[PDB]
Amino acid sequence: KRYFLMDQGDFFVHFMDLAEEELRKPVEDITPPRLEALLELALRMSTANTDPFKDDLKIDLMPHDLITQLELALSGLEAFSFDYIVKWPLSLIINRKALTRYQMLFRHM
């Protein structure tokens, strides 16, 4: 909830301010480990740097953009998402059928 549903807005007034100028480039023009290391940096000064499972946050990319619901160059803001790893105890709850909607909700927000 603090990350996808974004209730810890403290996190993003750093994170996107760091990552924005990297995200002005189109898709396939991005450096993903550079982005990942920018995550785990806003997530240092932010209040978010207190949670035992904060390390499960991954930067991923959606193609198709908010046009998703039934050109490629406009990207960054149009293409960005978070993800979480899961384990067999909790995967029976928090798997992709849920997280794909957490991403869609995050994307709009």
Binding site: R2, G9, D10, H14, T47
Partner: protein, 420 residues
């Protein structure tokens, strides 16, 4: 993005010290500078930090006629308020000339923090507008920030001449400083002195000795005004946004205030906001309007009732604001303040751009006209006279706040469709 406090003058430091004392109640910070044993919240938004947990105030204390800070450098909280810098008239141009000779030191001090601070947000000035060196030095510093750091919003929380008007050079002081507010400040979240003090006599017996007791209440006004910066929440985590929805143009930049269990000696959000929306609790005193409302609540209450409450204000028409274009009511549930105990288990504050504030500037202008038509308190002191050898900045100071009166009247009606 982290906030540069910029408090100056005696009263600004009296409210500032009490505000830092209140923040050290609302956050788990020891009097001895360090983390308090007690200790999900971010402190560096307001406090400087060395790695040994010294969560120091970003204070920029200043004086010219030494009376205040050596009387503050005696409490156990002195291990917090090490800014390193504690640098040393009551009338405008004489106060301005004792200022302005101090220039490189202030520039070096603020550069040292603007360079060492991680991500610069904006300068939170707190000082007299009535008099002292505030008349003078205060207007002088507000003639430098504009050129020093042009790409940030120069806020003020500065405190206004409202004391029945010895400090009889207050009308000239107020006019000249109010020009520097209107032309040079980027926001003015003003409060007006005895309009609080006379609400202090309403709540308790403080007939006269309450100026120091205003400092308690305004410290809650300051700490309330920063609630959703200091604790996690979905939106408005920042200075610029807390002002950006409420100030429409670079001219109409003043903001008004109000507090809920101000009678601090459970109900739903409708009760607290119905009480709060009474101009009895707006502590500053043609049918004028707001521009926008921001009012912030903390407590155990759920958010579901804030929408219901907006329908009840919308149907009541209890307070009304027609700016020429709409700029809305904005209200939010937020985390209750930690470490300190608190009564009134759900509570909050309003701020809104109440154009009726024009009446205070008009009272100021009336007092200036009634002293300017007799001219007893010119003093004829040589850096009061020849420092302003043709009086033109006194003379135009009236009309430029009159443009704020007039732009408020025009913006309050289907007009103001042009600049100038």
């Amino acid at each position: 993005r982290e906030i540069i406090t910029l408090q100056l003058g005696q009263c600004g430091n009296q409210i500032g010290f009490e505000f830092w004392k209140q923040l050290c109640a609302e956050h788990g910070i020891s009097p001895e500078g360090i983390v308090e044993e007690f200790a999900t919240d971010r402190k560096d938004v307001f406090f400087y930090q060395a790695d040994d947990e010294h969560y120091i105030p970003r204070a920029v204390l200043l004086d010219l006629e030494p009376r205040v800070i050596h009387s503050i450098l005696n409490s156990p909280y002195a291990k917090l308020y090490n800014p390193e810098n504690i640098y040393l008239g009551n009338n405008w141009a004489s106060g301005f000339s004792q200022g302005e000779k101090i220039h490189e030191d202030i520039f070096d001090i603020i550069d040292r923090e603007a360079d060492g601070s991680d991500s610069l947000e904006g300068f939170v000035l707190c000082h007299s507008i009535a008099g002292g060196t505030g008349s003078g030095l205060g207007s002088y510093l507000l003639e430098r920030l504009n050129d020093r750091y042009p790409k940030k919003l120069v806020q003020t929380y500065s405190v206004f001449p409202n004391q029945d008007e010895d400090v009889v050079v207050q009308p000239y002081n107020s006019l000249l400083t109010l020009k520097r507010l209107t032309q040079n400040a980027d926001c003015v979240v003003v409060l007006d002195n005895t309009a609080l003090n006379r609400i202090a006599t309403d709540r308790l017996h403080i007939q006269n000795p309450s100026f120091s007791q205003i400092n308690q209440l305004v410290s809650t006004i300051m700490s309330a005004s920063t609630t959703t910066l200091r604790y996690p929440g979905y939106m408005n985590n920042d200075l610029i946004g807390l002002i950006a929805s409420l100030i429409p143009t670079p001219r109409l930049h003043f903001l008004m205030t109000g507090y809920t269990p101000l009678t601090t000696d459970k109900t739903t959000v409708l009760d607290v906001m119905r009480r709060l929306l009474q101009p009895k609790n707006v502590m500053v005193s043609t049918n004028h309007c707001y521009i926008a409302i921001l009012n912030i609540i903390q407590g155990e209450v759920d958010p579901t009732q804030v929408h219901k409450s907006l329908q009840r204000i919308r149907e009541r028409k209890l307070a009304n604001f027609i700016p020429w274009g709409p700029a809305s009511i904005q209200v939010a549930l937020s985390r209750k303040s930690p470490y300190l105990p608190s009564a009134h288990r759900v509570s909050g504050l309003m701020m809104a751009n109440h154009t009726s504030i024009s009446s205070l500037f008009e009272r100021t202008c009336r007092q200036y006209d009634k002293l300017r038509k007799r001219e007893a308190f010119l003093e004829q002191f040589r850096k009061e006279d020849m420092f302003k050898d043709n009086f033109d900045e006194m003379d135009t100071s009236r009309e430029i706040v009159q443009q704020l009166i007039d732009e408020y009247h025009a913006a309050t009606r289907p007009d103001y469709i042009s600049w100038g």
